[PDB]
Ligand binder design. Structure first.
Ligand SMILES: NC(=O)C1=CN([C@@H]2O[C@H](COP(=O)(O)OP(=O)(O)OC[C@H]3O[C@@H](n4cnc5c(N)ncnc54)[C@H](OP(=O)(O)O)[C@@H]3O)[C@@H](O)[C@H]2O)C=CC1
Ligand SMILES: Nc1nc(N)c2c(Sc3ccc(N4CCOCC4)cc3)cccc2n1
Length: 192
């Protein structure tokens, strides 16, 4: 695959864009996890699938019985890895671009995490879209967090929901989803 458009998909707590605490998301949003699954899995073309890209630490944090993520090509980045196809669902690579050279029959590409991946790849011009779930809570400060997005959003534009809907196709987009004390919305951003 040559110079594909890539999307980042993340869930962040406004306004600081907190994303984790000691390796874990500080919340359990059952519907939000479902949306992550549907978006990264659905495809429109026939014999295709999407690819998910993750850092080695996130891979390692998934229980072994739960990896690879089903129905998607999993790509794991490590600075120590050789570019290699492990099996039909797993690729090892040392760069995003090198990993993409090993694939065919991929419809979309998503970077899924973690923090270091997000923060480094946001500056790669292959990244064309951001799918940010913006989470809100009455007392954001009550939530312990150590990891944050460092995204240059002054250079990105938040699109209208119509554009997101077009993006995700048939997926149902509910507004102001509430779970416990959290309220969230799905958003799409593109580069200015
Ligand atoms: O705190 C911890 C949280 O970890 P978190 O940041 O969320 O983990 P990530 O899921 O983001 O994994 C980070 C790891 O990904 C690999 N990696 C990161 N950036 C790149 C890059 N630009 N190119 C190639 N490989 C890359 C490195 O693996 P390696 O260390 O194996 O190089 C790095 O340690 C616990
Ligand atoms: N919108 C969205 N985006 C993701 N990318 C999701 C992941 S994948 C993921 C992997 C790593 C991290 N983290 C960042 C740093 O370490 C805490 C874990 C967060 C999400 C798992 C569940 C729901 C998700 N929701």
């Amino acid at each position: 695959m040559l110079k594909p458009n890539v999307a980042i998909i993340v869930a962040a707590l406004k306004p600081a864009l907190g994303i984790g605490y000691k390796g874990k998301m500080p919340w359990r949003l059952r519907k939000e996890i479902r949306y992550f699954k549907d978006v990264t899995t659905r495809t429109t073309k026939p014999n295709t699938r999407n690819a998910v890209i993750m850092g080695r630490k996130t891979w390692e944090s998934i229980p072994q019985k739960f990896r690879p993520l089903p129905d998607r090509l999993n790509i794991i980045l490590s600075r120590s890895y050789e570019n290699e196809i492990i099996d039909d669902n797993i690729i090892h690579a040392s760069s995003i671009e090198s990993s993409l050279n090993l694939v065919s029959d991929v419809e979309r590409v998503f970077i899924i995490g973690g923090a270091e991946i997000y923060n480094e790849l946001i500056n790669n011009s292959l990244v064309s879209h951001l799918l940010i779930t913006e989470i809100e809570h009455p007392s954001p400060e009550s939530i312990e967090m150590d990891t944050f997005l460092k995204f240059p959003l002054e250079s990105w534009t938040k699109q209208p929901k119509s554009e997101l809907q077009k993006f995700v196709g048939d997926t149902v987009l509910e507004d102001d989803i509430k779970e416990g004390d959290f309220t969230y919305n799905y958003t799409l951003w593109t580069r200015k």
